[PDB]
Design a protein around this ligand. Sequence first.
Ligand SMILES: Nc1ncnc2c1ncn2[C@@H]1O[C@H](COP(=O)(O)OP(=O)(O)OP(=O)(O)O)[C@@H](O)[C@H]1O
Ligand SMILES: Nc1ncnc2c1ncn2[C@@H]1O[C@H](COP(=O)(O)OP(=O)(O)OP(=O)(O)O)[C@@H](O)[C@H]1O
Lengths: 59, 65, 339, 339, 139
Amino acid sequence: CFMCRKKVGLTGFDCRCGNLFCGLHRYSDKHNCPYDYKAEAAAKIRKENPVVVAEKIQR
Amino acid sequence: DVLPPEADSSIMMLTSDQMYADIGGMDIQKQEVREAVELPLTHFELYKQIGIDPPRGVLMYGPPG
Amino acid sequence: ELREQLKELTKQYEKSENDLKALQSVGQIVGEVLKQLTEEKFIVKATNGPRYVVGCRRQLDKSKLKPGTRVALDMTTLTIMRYLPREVDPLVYNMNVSYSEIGGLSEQIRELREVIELPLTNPELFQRVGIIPPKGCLLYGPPGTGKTLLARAVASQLDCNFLKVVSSSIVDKYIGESARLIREMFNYARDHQPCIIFMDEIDAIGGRRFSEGTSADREIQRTLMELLNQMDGFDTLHRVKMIMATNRPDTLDPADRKIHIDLPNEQARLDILKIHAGPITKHGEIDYEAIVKLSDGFNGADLRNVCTEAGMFAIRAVQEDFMKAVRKVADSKKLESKL
Amino acid sequence: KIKENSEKIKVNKTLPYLVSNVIELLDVGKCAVIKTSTRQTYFLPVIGLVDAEKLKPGDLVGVNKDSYLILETLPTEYDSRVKAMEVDERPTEQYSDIGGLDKQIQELVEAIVLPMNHKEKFENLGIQPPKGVLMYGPPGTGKTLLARACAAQTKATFLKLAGPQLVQMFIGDGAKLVRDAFALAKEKAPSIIFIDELDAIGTKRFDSEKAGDREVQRTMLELLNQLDGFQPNTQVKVIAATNRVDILDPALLRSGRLDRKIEFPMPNEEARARIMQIHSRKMNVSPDVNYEELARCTDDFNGAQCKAVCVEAGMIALRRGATELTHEDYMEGILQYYA
Amino acid sequence: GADREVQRILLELLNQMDGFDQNVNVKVIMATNRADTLDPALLRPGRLDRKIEFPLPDRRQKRLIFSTITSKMNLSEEVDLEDYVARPDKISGADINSICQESGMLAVRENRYIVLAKDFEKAYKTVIKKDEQEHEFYK
Ligand SMILES: Nc1ncnc2c1ncn2[C@@H]1O[C@H](COP(=O)(O)OP(=O)(O)OP(=O)(O)O)[C@@H](O)[C@H]1O
Ligand SMILES: Nc1ncnc2c1ncn2[C@@H]1O[C@H](COP(=O)(O)OP(=O)(O)OP(=O)(O)O)[C@@H](O)[C@H]1O
């Protein structure tokens, strides 16, 4: 239920700030969404990243 | 042991069915089928005498219905 | 708690002893007899495939069992223990409800009933002996005219056995068995003489008698051919009724009783929309005049759409809004525009 | 000694309870007609350690390979790896981050979730929830986006489309995959079925090119059956996805089958700006951006191209290890005579 | 493929109905409706098969078929079958039986006790014709 429009629409899109934004004001650029999008990107990419170890080390 | 000739899945009771006299017309097919399969099975001598061998198989081919 | 504890223990004893007794009864082998060989000798082809000759326990009334009857032979000696009736495994499936709650289809419902239900009723021939009433009916229908709902209604109305079957009966085990399933169906019906079999989507299997098409085409046409043979032919029926529902390109199945089902509706469109407005009154004006004036297609799901979205509207702010129902009418019609 | 009975029942129920079908039930007490993997047919006068009533023709039950007594039944099985494909590790994305598309998400979220959670409104209104949904992704832009974002509800399961055309040349089958899929959806709690690339199936249904075609038509007709037959199918939610919008089956089309055919349009300048912003949210963007003017430069840059461009910009800046947008090397990442 | 199995059974049938030699009291009969799509190998023109047609009826055949089918039916003095048959049409025997059955179905609908020319005409319409699109320009 975002301050602009005081919207309560069931369609309300519920963001990482848990807030059913106005249909037109659902974007972080618009509402200063206080979330660490870039930090989460770094963590996820580090987790999912494939690295070639060259398959030479052996017991 | 050698069982009686029969000993397999098939139909022999005829399940009854419906004596002719009811198909209606179709005289040509009636005569042909009756001769080929029905009586008189005696005319085999006429077949061999004429030299024309006994027909077997009819194939009854025609439009559906 | 003496009596209660004793009762509970006794119940446990009873159940446990019954279970132990149950655990000590091996099964049989199911197989159909083939010939009454002399008196105490029968040739039985066990379902697993081998064919045997065995003698039967005395208390079996040898007259009962006959070529084709099923029996349960024993494990070790394989003596006929108990004869069984016919067998139909994957058909409990084939055996909601509605009572003329569809709207329209007056003449066609009358025709279908008078062809499929009335003859089975007590007015069996009543001098009508000359008819041999029709054994099959067809339901020319575009996608949703009211075919499946009609089937539901007749199934709930007649109250006899019903076998709703679909062209998705095709199976393959490095060989064909569709015809075998078909003959199972027909045998089931013939045993349950009072019955309504209902093929639907006969287009697929009906196909066409394409020659040199492919192994698939030959198999499909063979399945069709089983249908034809068991509809007509030596499998002549007396008390079953067949239903079909698909488009025109169906091989060659004339005779019967084909009925056209028209997608548009004259004023039973108004009817259908009233039935679909059956949901709770809108708290005021109930006239449908708005949607009445313009209407095309065949569905009432427009009613569900309008009602749901108007409930959403009301929550945002009853639904006395036929001016709003015309909205979802326009929505369905734009879907029509799409196709 | 009831306990001792139980333990000895258990031990004689060793373990490898060879599993067998429950093909038929009868009575004379009740019995069983079980069938086994090794094609065989055992009548059991004593069914075994089962109530003999919960059974129903068609079921998998453990059995003692020698006694042939139905031991502990097992939950039904689903073949063709329908169960294996019908898994989902709760797609990580939680928000509906798509872009300008708002009406599409509105209607889809309403028609899907609201029945699931706030079915109270629907029941109060006396309305069956909205009918099966289609979702035109003509270019694919946002198609899987909406699907995956919808994969963020409280809890449910999503049946992806994955090779329903897995049919053997030798006739194959009428989408046994579809049969098992709908069975699993029916048996489990509220479930959803994402028919991806539905275009792979569906057609005018009359073209008579060659084999494989006809198999696709049986699979299509099986789909139609699964939701239009004598079945309420209340506890199901089908959502279809296609790009060849025009060429599709007129019956599969809609009105009880695929209604509310949401449409995905070409993103406008605002939509392109929003999507690029969404993909840049995690991007290490410097405090200077012309997002709107980049959207203007897009010039029909509808699809994931925005995401691809943000990635290419990341790599471009990474040539030199920077965190800023040139805004024109960005166009060259985008991608004589006169002039 | 399974074409192997089907052809195998085909040739087995051929060889076996050959094993039925002449001077025999086993007579083989088979239906095929349409024929053209049949094996001359199966026909084995030398022997194992003689061929017979089974076409649609002639006018006299239609008269006889109508008389036979309708004798069991409770007709009326206003039947006019001798002209119903005379009508030109491509009706087949199944079509005649359908005519009689649907005429009776009407008769019953309106609770008739004896079928009437009106019911036969209605059955004629409901079971025969329906064929058009021979647009006058199209021809
Ligand atoms: N004439 C009708 N009256 C009322 N509801 C109808 C009618 N026709 C269809 N419906 C609605 O549509 C659904 C049933 O569709 P219907 O029985 O018409 O399909 P069908 O004609 O068998 O379809 P298809 O030809 O595409 O296989 C139910 O929601 C039923 O309420
Ligand atoms: N509006 C959008 N918001 C976010 N990502 C999008 C958007 N449009 C496309 N994408 C990107 O597209 C990819 C997902 O594909 P998408 O859902 O667009 O289907 P598609 O592959 O184009 O479908 P089709 O099979 O119809 O061609 C992901 O990279 C996603 O980031």
